[PDB]
PDB file of all heavy atoms in Angstrom:
ATOM      1  N   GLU Q 298     -98.856  96.911 -15.104  1.00  4.99           N
ATOM      2  CA  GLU Q 298     -99.680  97.785 -14.233  1.00  4.99           C
ATOM      3  C   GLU Q 298     -99.424  99.263 -14.575  1.00  4.99           C
ATOM      4  O   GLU Q 298    -100.362 100.067 -14.743  1.00  4.99           O
ATOM      5  CB  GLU Q 298     -99.340  97.534 -12.756  1.00  4.99           C
ATOM      6  CG  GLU Q 298    -100.014  98.471 -11.750  1.00  4.99           C
ATOM      7  CD  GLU Q 298    -101.445  98.073 -11.396  1.00  4.99           C
ATOM      8  OE1 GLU Q 298    -101.932  97.046 -11.944  1.00  4.99           O
ATOM      9  OE2 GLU Q 298    -102.078  98.791 -10.558  1.00  4.99           O
ATOM     10  N   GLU Q 312    -110.720  98.797 -19.539  1.00  2.00           N
ATOM     11  CA  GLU Q 312    -111.064  97.967 -20.695  1.00  2.00           C
ATOM     12  C   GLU Q 312    -110.318  98.325 -21.987  1.00  2.00           C
ATOM     13  O   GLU Q 312    -109.650  97.476 -22.572  1.00  2.00           O
ATOM     14  CB  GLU Q 312    -112.570  98.084 -20.941  1.00  2.00           C
ATOM     15  CG  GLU Q 312    -113.100  97.270 -22.099  1.00  2.00           C
ATOM     16  CD  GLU Q 312    -114.557  96.876 -21.900  1.00  2.00           C
ATOM     17  OE1 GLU Q 312    -115.442  97.723 -22.126  1.00  2.00           O
ATOM     18  OE2 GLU Q 312    -114.807  95.717 -21.490  1.00  2.00           O
ATOM     19  N   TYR Q 316    -107.419  96.476 -24.144  1.00  2.00           N
ATOM     20  CA  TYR Q 316    -107.644  96.131 -25.536  1.00  2.00           C
ATOM     21  C   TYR Q 316    -106.606  96.772 -26.427  1.00  2.00           C
ATOM     22  O   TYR Q 316    -106.125  96.132 -27.357  1.00  2.00           O
ATOM     23  CB  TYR Q 316    -109.031  96.584 -26.014  1.00  2.00           C
ATOM     24  CG  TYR Q 316    -110.222  95.909 -25.387  1.00  2.00           C
ATOM     25  CD1 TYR Q 316    -111.481  96.469 -25.524  1.00  2.00           C
ATOM     26  CD2 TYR Q 316    -110.112  94.697 -24.683  1.00  2.00           C
ATOM     27  CE1 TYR Q 316    -112.592  95.871 -24.970  1.00  2.00           C
ATOM     28  CE2 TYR Q 316    -111.227  94.090 -24.124  1.00  2.00           C
ATOM     29  CZ  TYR Q 316    -112.461  94.682 -24.278  1.00  2.00           C
ATOM     30  OH  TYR Q 316    -113.596  94.117 -23.725  1.00  2.00           O
ATOM     31  N   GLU Q 331     -95.263  85.843 -39.175  1.00 10.01           N
ATOM     32  CA  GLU Q 331     -95.288  85.773 -40.644  1.00 10.01           C
ATOM     33  C   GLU Q 331     -93.911  86.004 -41.217  1.00 10.01           C
ATOM     34  O   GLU Q 331     -93.396  85.192 -42.006  1.00 10.01           O
ATOM     35  CB  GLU Q 331     -96.254  86.799 -41.251  1.00 10.01           C
ATOM     36  CG  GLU Q 331     -97.554  86.167 -41.763  1.00 10.01           C
ATOM     37  CD  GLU Q 331     -98.120  85.165 -40.758  1.00 10.01           C
ATOM     38  OE1 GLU Q 331     -98.599  85.628 -39.675  1.00 10.01           O
ATOM     39  OE2 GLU Q 331     -98.032  83.936 -41.050  1.00 10.01           O
ATOM     40  N   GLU Q 334     -91.411  83.212 -40.659  1.00  9.66           N
ATOM     41  CA  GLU Q 334     -91.670  81.952 -41.347  1.00  9.66           C
ATOM     42  C   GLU Q 334     -91.294  82.048 -42.825  1.00  9.66           C
ATOM     43  O   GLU Q 334     -90.988  81.036 -43.439  1.00  9.66           O
ATOM     44  CB  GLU Q 334     -93.129  81.503 -41.196  1.00  9.66           C
ATOM     45  CG  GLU Q 334     -93.277  79.955 -41.113  1.00  9.66           C
ATOM     46  CD  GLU Q 334     -93.899  79.484 -39.808  1.00  9.66           C
ATOM     47  OE1 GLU Q 334     -94.915  80.098 -39.414  1.00  9.66           O
ATOM     48  OE2 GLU Q 334     -93.395  78.519 -39.187  1.00  9.66           O
ATOM     49  N   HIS Q 335     -91.302  83.262 -43.375  1.00  7.38           N
ATOM     50  CA  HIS Q 335     -90.933  83.512 -44.774  1.00  7.38           C
ATOM     51  C   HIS Q 335     -89.535  84.103 -44.989  1.00  7.38           C
ATOM     52  O   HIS Q 335     -89.120  84.297 -46.131  1.00  7.38           O
ATOM     53  CB  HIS Q 335     -91.965  84.410 -45.408  1.00  7.38           C
ATOM     54  CG  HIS Q 335     -93.359  83.919 -45.205  1.00  7.38           C
ATOM     55  ND1 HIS Q 335     -94.242  84.525 -44.337  1.00  7.38           N
ATOM     56  CD2 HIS Q 335     -94.010  82.851 -45.729  1.00  7.38           C
ATOM     57  CE1 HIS Q 335     -95.389  83.866 -44.354  1.00  7.38           C
ATOM     58  NE2 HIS Q 335     -95.273  82.845 -45.189  1.00  7.38           N
ATOM     59  N   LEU Q 346    -101.570  91.474 -58.207  1.00  9.15           N
ATOM     60  CA  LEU Q 346    -100.823  90.473 -57.474  1.00  9.15           C
ATOM     61  C   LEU Q 346     -99.335  90.693 -57.727  1.00  9.15           C
ATOM     62  O   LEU Q 346     -98.546  90.686 -56.787  1.00  9.15           O
ATOM     63  CB  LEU Q 346    -101.266  89.068 -57.870  1.00  9.15           C
ATOM     64  CG  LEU Q 346    -100.720  87.959 -56.961  1.00  9.15           C
ATOM     65  CD1 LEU Q 346    -101.349  88.035 -55.550  1.00  9.15           C
ATOM     66  CD2 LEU Q 346    -100.909  86.575 -57.613  1.00  9.15           C
ATOM     67  N   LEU Q 352     -93.721  94.444 -54.255  1.00 12.46           N
ATOM     68  CA  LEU Q 352     -93.751  95.385 -53.135  1.00 12.46           C
ATOM     69  C   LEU Q 352     -92.954  94.830 -51.957  1.00 12.46           C
ATOM     70  O   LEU Q 352     -92.092  95.513 -51.425  1.00 12.46           O
ATOM     71  CB  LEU Q 352     -95.191  95.681 -52.692  1.00 12.46           C
ATOM     72  CG  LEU Q 352     -95.464  97.026 -51.996  1.00 12.46           C
ATOM     73  CD1 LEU Q 352     -96.772  96.981 -51.197  1.00 12.46           C
ATOM     74  CD2 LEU Q 352     -94.327  97.445 -51.068  1.00 12.46           C
ATOM     75  N   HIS Q 364     -97.189 100.443 -41.011  1.00 10.06           N
ATOM     76  CA  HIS Q 364     -98.507 100.831 -41.522  1.00 10.06           C
ATOM     77  C   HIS Q 364     -99.631 100.324 -40.614  1.00 10.06           C
ATOM     78  O   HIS Q 364    -100.516 101.095 -40.271  1.00 10.06           O
ATOM     79  CB  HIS Q 364     -98.744 100.286 -42.934  1.00 10.06           C
ATOM     80  CG  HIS Q 364    -100.121 100.568 -43.456  1.00 10.06           C
ATOM     81  ND1 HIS Q 364    -101.227  99.839 -43.077  1.00 10.06           N
ATOM     82  CD2 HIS Q 364    -100.576 101.522 -44.305  1.00 10.06           C
ATOM     83  CE1 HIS Q 364    -102.301 100.327 -43.672  1.00 10.06           C
ATOM     84  NE2 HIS Q 364    -101.932 101.347 -44.423  1.00 10.06           N
ATOM     85  N   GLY Q 372    -106.713 104.464 -35.194  1.00 12.66           N
ATOM     86  CA  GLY Q 372    -108.019 103.914 -34.880  1.00 12.66           C
ATOM     87  C   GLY Q 372    -108.402 104.090 -33.423  1.00 12.66           C
ATOM     88  O   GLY Q 372    -109.579 104.354 -33.121  1.00 12.66           O
ATOM     89  N   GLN Q 376    -111.628 106.016 -31.982  1.00 22.65           N
ATOM     90  CA  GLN Q 376    -112.526 105.318 -31.078  1.00 22.65           C
ATOM     91  C   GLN Q 376    -112.709 106.066 -29.776  1.00 22.65           C
ATOM     92  O   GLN Q 376    -113.829 106.186 -29.286  1.00 22.65           O
ATOM     93  CB  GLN Q 376    -111.992 103.941 -30.751  1.00 22.65           C
ATOM     94  CG  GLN Q 376    -112.180 102.927 -31.851  1.00 22.65           C
ATOM     95  CD  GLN Q 376    -111.410 101.689 -31.544  1.00 22.65           C
ATOM     96  OE1 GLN Q 376    -111.976 100.595 -31.419  1.00 22.65           O
ATOM     97  NE2 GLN Q 376    -110.105 101.850 -31.354  1.00 22.65           N
TER      98      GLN Q 376
ATOM     99  N   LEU I 345    -100.281  78.551 -38.995  1.00  2.00           N
ATOM    100  CA  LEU I 345     -98.886  79.029 -39.085  1.00  2.00           C
ATOM    101  C   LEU I 345     -97.965  78.145 -39.917  1.00  2.00           C
ATOM    102  O   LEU I 345     -97.843  76.963 -39.635  1.00  2.00           O
ATOM    103  CB  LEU I 345     -98.255  79.088 -37.692  1.00  2.00           C
ATOM    104  CG  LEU I 345     -98.111  80.408 -36.964  1.00  2.00           C
ATOM    105  CD1 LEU I 345     -97.558  80.093 -35.546  1.00  2.00           C
ATOM    106  CD2 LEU I 345     -97.184  81.363 -37.741  1.00  2.00           C
ATOM    107  N   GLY I 346     -97.287  78.729 -40.899  1.00  2.00           N
ATOM    108  CA  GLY I 346     -96.305  77.986 -41.698  1.00  2.00           C
ATOM    109  C   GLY I 346     -96.868  77.067 -42.775  1.00  2.00           C
ATOM    110  O   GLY I 346     -96.163  76.227 -43.314  1.00  2.00           O
ATOM    111  N   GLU I 358    -105.974  88.632 -55.069  1.00  2.00           N
ATOM    112  CA  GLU I 358    -106.199  89.500 -56.243  1.00  2.00           C
ATOM    113  C   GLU I 358    -107.535  90.236 -56.138  1.00  2.00           C
ATOM    114  O   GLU I 358    -107.586  91.464 -56.241  1.00  2.00           O
ATOM    115  CB  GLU I 358    -106.143  88.668 -57.545  1.00  2.00           C
ATOM    116  CG  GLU I 358    -106.563  89.392 -58.857  1.00  2.00           C
ATOM    117  CD  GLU I 358    -105.533  90.419 -59.313  1.00  2.00           C
ATOM    118  OE1 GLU I 358    -104.437  90.441 -58.698  1.00  2.00           O
ATOM    119  OE2 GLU I 358    -105.805  91.191 -60.284  1.00  2.00           O
ATOM    120  N   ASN I 373    -101.833 100.641 -49.632  1.00  2.75           N
ATOM    121  CA  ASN I 373    -102.821 100.678 -48.545  1.00  2.75           C
ATOM    122  C   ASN I 373    -103.775  99.478 -48.514  1.00  2.75           C
ATOM    123  O   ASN I 373    -104.077  98.947 -47.436  1.00  2.75           O
ATOM    124  CB  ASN I 373    -103.643 101.982 -48.548  1.00  2.75           C
ATOM    125  CG  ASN I 373    -103.058 103.063 -47.633  1.00  2.75           C
ATOM    126  OD1 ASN I 373    -102.025 102.867 -46.976  1.00  2.75           O
ATOM    127  ND2 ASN I 373    -103.706 104.208 -47.604  1.00  2.75           N
ATOM    128  N   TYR I 376    -101.542  96.418 -47.272  1.00  5.36           N
ATOM    129  CA  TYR I 376    -101.127  96.491 -45.886  1.00  5.36           C
ATOM    130  C   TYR I 376    -102.360  96.393 -44.959  1.00  5.36           C
ATOM    131  O   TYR I 376    -102.268  95.841 -43.867  1.00  5.36           O
ATOM    132  CB  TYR I 376    -100.320  97.765 -45.636  1.00  5.36           C
ATOM    133  CG  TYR I 376     -98.963  97.815 -46.316  1.00  5.36           C
ATOM    134  CD1 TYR I 376     -98.277  99.016 -46.427  1.00  5.36           C
ATOM    135  CD2 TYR I 376     -98.330  96.663 -46.801  1.00  5.36           C
ATOM    136  CE1 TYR I 376     -97.031  99.078 -47.005  1.00  5.36           C
ATOM    137  CE2 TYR I 376     -97.090  96.725 -47.403  1.00  5.36           C
ATOM    138  CZ  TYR I 376     -96.446  97.939 -47.503  1.00  5.36           C
ATOM    139  OH  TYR I 376     -95.190  98.024 -48.100  1.00  5.36           O
ATOM    140  N   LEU I 386    -104.587  86.460 -36.449  1.00  2.00           N
ATOM    141  CA  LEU I 386    -103.796  85.276 -36.153  1.00  2.00           C
ATOM    142  C   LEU I 386    -103.221  85.368 -34.761  1.00  2.00           C
ATOM    143  O   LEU I 386    -103.400  84.449 -33.946  1.00  2.00           O
ATOM    144  CB  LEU I 386    -102.678  85.103 -37.201  1.00  2.00           C
ATOM    145  CG  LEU I 386    -101.680  83.961 -37.023  1.00  2.00           C
ATOM    146  CD1 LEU I 386    -102.314  82.646 -37.351  1.00  2.00           C
ATOM    147  CD2 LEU I 386    -100.495  84.189 -37.916  1.00  2.00           C
ATOM    148  N   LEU I 407    -104.807  97.535 -10.930  1.00  2.00           N
ATOM    149  CA  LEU I 407    -105.416  97.695 -12.255  1.00  2.00           C
ATOM    150  C   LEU I 407    -105.370  96.406 -13.057  1.00  2.00           C
ATOM    151  O   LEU I 407    -106.347  96.010 -13.688  1.00  2.00           O
ATOM    152  CB  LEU I 407    -104.688  98.774 -13.056  1.00  2.00           C
ATOM    153  CG  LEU I 407    -104.710 100.192 -12.512  1.00  2.00           C
ATOM    154  CD1 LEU I 407    -103.915 101.087 -13.438  1.00  2.00           C
ATOM    155  CD2 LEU I 407    -106.137 100.673 -12.371  1.00  2.00           C
ATOM    156  N   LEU I 408    -104.205  95.778 -13.036  1.00  2.00           N
ATOM    157  CA  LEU I 408    -103.986  94.523 -13.721  1.00  2.00           C
ATOM    158  C   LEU I 408    -104.918  93.436 -13.190  1.00  2.00           C
ATOM    159  O   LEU I 408    -105.479  92.657 -13.958  1.00  2.00           O
ATOM    160  CB  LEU I 408    -102.527  94.116 -13.537  1.00  2.00           C
ATOM    161  CG  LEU I 408    -102.035  92.876 -14.268  1.00  2.00           C
ATOM    162  CD1 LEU I 408    -102.475  92.883 -15.721  1.00  2.00           C
ATOM    163  CD2 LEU I 408    -100.526  92.805 -14.141  1.00  2.00           C
ATOM    164  N   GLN I 418    -115.823  88.521 -19.735  1.00  2.00           N
ATOM    165  CA  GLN I 418    -116.115  88.615 -21.159  1.00  2.00           C
ATOM    166  C   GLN I 418    -114.915  88.039 -21.909  1.00  2.00           C
ATOM    167  O   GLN I 418    -113.920  88.733 -22.086  1.00  2.00           O
ATOM    168  CB  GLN I 418    -116.340  90.084 -21.552  1.00  2.00           C
ATOM    169  CG  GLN I 418    -115.279  91.038 -20.987  1.00  2.00           C
ATOM    170  CD  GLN I 418    -115.060  92.287 -21.807  1.00  2.00           C
ATOM    171  OE1 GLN I 418    -114.059  92.409 -22.518  1.00  2.00           O
ATOM    172  NE2 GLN I 418    -115.976  93.239 -21.691  1.00  2.00           N
ATOM    173  N   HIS I 426    -113.008  94.717 -30.853  1.00  2.00           N
ATOM    174  CA  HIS I 426    -112.584  96.098 -30.628  1.00  2.00           C
ATOM    175  C   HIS I 426    -111.316  96.454 -31.412  1.00  2.00           C
ATOM    176  O   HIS I 426    -111.208  97.538 -31.987  1.00  2.00           O
ATOM    177  CB  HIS I 426    -112.369  96.379 -29.127  1.00  2.00           C
ATOM    178  CG  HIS I 426    -112.363  97.842 -28.798  1.00  2.00           C
ATOM    179  ND1 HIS I 426    -113.461  98.495 -28.278  1.00  2.00           N
ATOM    180  CD2 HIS I 426    -111.410  98.793 -28.981  1.00  2.00           C
ATOM    181  CE1 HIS I 426    -113.176  99.780 -28.133  1.00  2.00           C
ATOM    182  NE2 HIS I 426    -111.939  99.987 -28.556  1.00  2.00           N
ATOM    183  N   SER I 430    -110.696  99.176 -34.428  1.00  2.00           N
ATOM    184  CA  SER I 430    -109.567 100.115 -34.441  1.00  2.00           C
ATOM    185  C   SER I 430    -108.794 100.103 -35.793  1.00  2.00           C
ATOM    186  O   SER I 430    -108.487 101.147 -36.353  1.00  2.00           O
ATOM    187  CB  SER I 430    -108.597  99.822 -33.300  1.00  2.00           C
ATOM    188  OG  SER I 430    -109.290  99.618 -32.095  1.00  2.00           O
TER     189      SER I 430
END
Side-chain angles (χ1 to χ4, degrees):
Chain Q
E298 174 82 0
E312 181 152 79
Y316 294 165
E331 255 45 70
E334 214 119 46
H335 309 107
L346 191 69
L352 206 200
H364 176 282
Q376 284 170 120
Chain I
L345 258 175
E358 171 72 8
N373 266 0
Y376 292 165
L386 176 74
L407 297 179
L408 185 47
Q418 46 153 255
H426 198 100
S430 314

